């Protein structure tokens, strides 16, 4: 008998993330005695989906910022703008990410009709 042409488990599942590597990490991570056949496929699909979401939002942020390369600032903007990811990554700090620009409403200057020079009370 001759071996059939090898097909990657990711190719069978139609994924980009590695099913085989995920299976190895599950086995060697000491999570359980045994790992099912479909558990790596499910986990790889979920990780690929989440990565796609964050990359989509980050690319949108970079495009809005007129940049063609995603940098940590754009990842921070994407994470904090979307409420779902922000809830997921609430306790996470992104290096070189900065903070969302917001100023409390009471801090903004109070408009005044008088155009006279400011003076002490």
């Amino acid at each position: 008998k001759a071996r059939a042409k090898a097909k990657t488990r990711s190719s069978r599942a139609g994924l980009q993330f590695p099913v085989g590597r995920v299976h190895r990490l599950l086995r060697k991570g000491n999570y359980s005695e045994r790992v099912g056949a479909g558990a790596p496929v499910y986990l790889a699909a979920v990780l690929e989906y989440l990565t796609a979401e964050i990359l989509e939002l980050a690319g949108n942020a970079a495009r809005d910022n007129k940049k063609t390369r995603i940098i940590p600032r754009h990842l921070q903007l994407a994470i904090r703008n979307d409420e779902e990811l922000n809830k997921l990554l609430g306790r996470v700090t992104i290096a070189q990410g900065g903070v969302l620009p917001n100023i409390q409403a009471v801090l903004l200057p109070k408009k005044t009709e008088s155009h006279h020079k400011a003076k002490g009370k």
């Binding site: 069978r12 599942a13 139609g14 479909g38 496929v41 499910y42 986990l43 699909a45 979920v46 690929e48």
Partner: peptide, 9 residues
């Protein structure tokens, strides 16, 4: 996504 991937696999 996970259910789709497992079914396809």
């Amino acid at each position: 996504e996970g259910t789709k991937a497992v079914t396809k696999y």
